[PDB]
Every structure is written in structure tokens, then in C-alpha cells.
Design an enzyme around this catalytic site. Sequence first.
Site, mmCIF file in Angstrom:
data_model
loop_
_atom_site.group_PDB
_atom_site.id
_atom_site.type_symbol
_atom_site.label_atom_id
_atom_site.label_comp_id
_atom_site.label_asym_id
_atom_site.label_seq_id
_atom_site.Cartn_x
_atom_site.Cartn_y
_atom_site.Cartn_z
ATOM 1 N N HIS A 74 0.834 -1.200 0.000
ATOM 2 C CA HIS A 74 0.000 0.000 0.000
ATOM 3 C C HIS A 74 0.879 1.265 0.000
ATOM 4 O O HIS A 74 2.102 1.166 0.080
ATOM 5 C CB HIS A 74 -1.095 -0.021 1.088
ATOM 6 C CG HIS A 74 -0.593 0.203 2.479
ATOM 7 N ND1 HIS A 74 -0.066 -0.804 3.257
ATOM 8 C CD2 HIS A 74 -0.593 1.317 3.250
ATOM 9 C CE1 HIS A 74 0.260 -0.310 4.443
ATOM 10 N NE2 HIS A 74 -0.049 0.971 4.459
ATOM 11 N N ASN A 104 -2.977 2.720 12.524
ATOM 12 C CA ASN A 104 -3.451 3.964 11.929
ATOM 13 C C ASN A 104 -4.733 3.722 11.157
ATOM 14 O O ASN A 104 -4.735 2.988 10.169
ATOM 15 C CB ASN A 104 -2.353 4.538 11.016
ATOM 16 C CG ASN A 104 -2.771 5.817 10.303
ATOM 17 O OD1 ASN A 104 -3.936 6.190 10.288
ATOM 18 N ND2 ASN A 104 -1.803 6.470 9.658
ATOM 19 N N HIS A 142 -7.217 -1.512 5.833
ATOM 20 C CA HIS A 142 -6.208 -0.661 6.415
ATOM 21 C C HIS A 142 -6.082 0.666 5.653
ATOM 22 O O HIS A 142 -5.970 1.741 6.251
ATOM 23 C CB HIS A 142 -4.878 -1.374 6.453
ATOM 24 C CG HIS A 142 -3.765 -0.472 6.846
ATOM 25 N ND1 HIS A 142 -3.663 0.060 8.115
ATOM 26 C CD2 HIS A 142 -2.738 0.043 6.128
ATOM 27 C CE1 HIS A 142 -2.605 0.846 8.170
ATOM 28 N NE2 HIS A 142 -2.026 0.849 6.977
ATOM 29 N N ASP A 188 5.323 4.446 5.094
ATOM 30 C CA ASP A 188 6.147 3.335 5.594
ATOM 31 C C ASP A 188 6.197 2.136 4.664
ATOM 32 O O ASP A 188 6.868 1.131 4.960
ATOM 33 C CB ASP A 188 5.732 2.911 7.004
ATOM 34 C CG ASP A 188 4.301 2.401 7.098
ATOM 35 O OD1 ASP A 188 3.555 2.347 6.090
ATOM 36 O OD2 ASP A 188 3.912 2.054 8.241
ATOM 37 N N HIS A 242 1.152 4.048 1.962
ATOM 38 C CA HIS A 242 1.602 4.816 3.124
ATOM 39 C C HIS A 242 3.089 5.015 3.067
ATOM 40 O O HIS A 242 3.809 4.153 2.555
ATOM 41 C CB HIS A 242 1.225 4.152 4.463
ATOM 42 C CG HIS A 242 -0.145 4.520 4.949
ATOM 43 N ND1 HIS A 242 -0.870 3.722 5.813
ATOM 44 C CD2 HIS A 242 -0.911 5.612 4.708
ATOM 45 C CE1 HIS A 242 -2.027 4.309 6.077
ATOM 46 N NE2 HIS A 242 -2.080 5.449 5.413
HETATM 47 ZN ZN LIG Z 1 -0.387 1.867 6.326
#
Ligand SMILES: [Zn+2]
Length: 215
Positions: free
Chosen positions: A74, A168, A137, A78, A76
Site C-alpha cells: 500500500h 493507523n 487498512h 512506511d 503509506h
Molecule cells: Zn499503512
Amino acid sequence: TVIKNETGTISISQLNKNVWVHTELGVPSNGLVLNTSKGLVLVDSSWDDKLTKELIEMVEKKFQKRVTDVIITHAHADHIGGIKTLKERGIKAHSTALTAELAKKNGYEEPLGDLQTVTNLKFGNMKVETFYPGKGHTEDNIVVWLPQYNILVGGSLVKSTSAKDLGNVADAYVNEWSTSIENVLKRYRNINAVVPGHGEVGDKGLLLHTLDLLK
Ligand SMILES: [Zn+2]
């Protein structure tokens, strides 16, 4: 078999002959290293360029091979955070188009945006299926399935056995997340191991545990 860097921030652990889990501290984060006859494939890189580069250097040293491909699960920070490193090293950064769009939206260099809802990749003899199960998520999260091993990489869609927290959720579709996990369960009827976004590798029980958290 668990091998580490000198700081202890990066570790790789063998799951089977050609499948390794890589873990970095950013909080740990898991992905896979797939040792193939045509080079190394990563499922997810790391939090940022420094750790992503260290990870690549570690595995490339260990297996004396190029990392050829990374699957980005994904968008994000990170997960997309080492994208500059991947692109400079000629590593193909596979992602869905949505992940690529979100990565750009986050200010990152874009991954490939090549993955469709179901994408089967094959690297030498290593088979990899990517699957977009729906939002959870994040809007874009995908899972990765190794059909030769019945190993599911859950990423951030799947919490570990000790995890009581979904993490998150600012970007999450909490209600839809259960449906998405159900889509994974319906799709893969015999799962052996499941790799959570962070924490210890488990089994289908992790998906159930995650559904429990979501209830
Ligand atoms: Zn994430």
C-alpha cells in the site's frame, strides 16, 4: 535461521527454502524476500530510503543476486518510503494503479501501478499472486499469495496474534476491512502461513483475530 545487521534494525528469517521474512524497525515491519533463480523479489521494502537501501544491500550480499522486483502492498509512507532507492537501482516497484496514484498524492516517486485486482507474477520458478481484496487498512491495500507454499502476506490488513490495536485508521475503511478480509478468506481456502504487517508469522487464525479486532 535469523540473520541481522549490526544495529539489529534489519533482520531476515527463513520461512522455507526460498522464502524469507525481512523485518525492520522504524516499530517493526515485515515483508518477504523471495530467492529466485532470476534474482531477489521483495514483498514490501522498508520505511525509508536508508533502511530500504540497507535491506537491499543485505539481501543482495547474502544471496549474491540482484533485487529485481518489489511488490508495494500500500501507499503509506512506511511502505512507499524507499521508492527513490528502488527506482535508482532499477528495481521494478510493482503496485496497483491506486497505490501509485496515492503515492504521488503523498509526494512520492510513483511505483509502476501495474498490478490488477488479480495479478500472477512468476520469477524463475517462484509464483506470486497479488490480490486486491477491497479497502481496509487503506483504500489500496493488497495481499500477496505464494501458491506454491500457501503463504499469505497480509501486510497491514492483518494484525499479529498479540496485537490489540488496528494501528493507523485515519486512512482506513474500518467497516469495509472485515469484508476485505472475508474476500481473502473466500479466495484462499487452504492457507498455511500468514505474514502480518508486523509481528510473528502465524496462520489463518491471524485473519480471524483481525476480524475479531474489527468487530
Ligand atoms: Zn499503512
